[PDB]
């Protein structure tokens, strides 16, 4: 399992453990469901770049204890 560091702006320690086979597609909606918000309302920023729905945990370079940010979009979902 790959445990990513999901530190919220409010200083919250969220441990999101994913796998290598899993698609980042479901990862995005799962986070939305966890926060109780519509899909595409939040944008994930990794090394400045935004995570796409067709992205994979294999590309870019994601490891254990990897720090990633997520902020609210302007679209509203």
């Amino acid at each position: 399992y790959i445990k990513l560091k999901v530190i919220g702006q409010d200083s919250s320690e969220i441990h999101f453990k994913v796998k290598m086979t899993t698609h980042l597609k479901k990862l995005k909606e799962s986070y939305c469901q966890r926060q109780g918000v519509p899909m595409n309302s939040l944008r994930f920023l990794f090394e400045g770049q935004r995570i796409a729905d067709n992205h994979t945990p294999k590309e870019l370079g994601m490891e254990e204890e990897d720090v990633i940010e997520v902020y609210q979009e302007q679209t509203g979902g």
Binding site: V6, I14, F16, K25, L27, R34
Partner: peptide, 12 residues
């Protein structure tokens, strides 16, 4: 404090 643990299972 705040600790959140979520496990997701996704397969190709």
């Amino acid at each position: 404090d705040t600790a959140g643990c979520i496990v997701i299972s996704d397969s190709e």
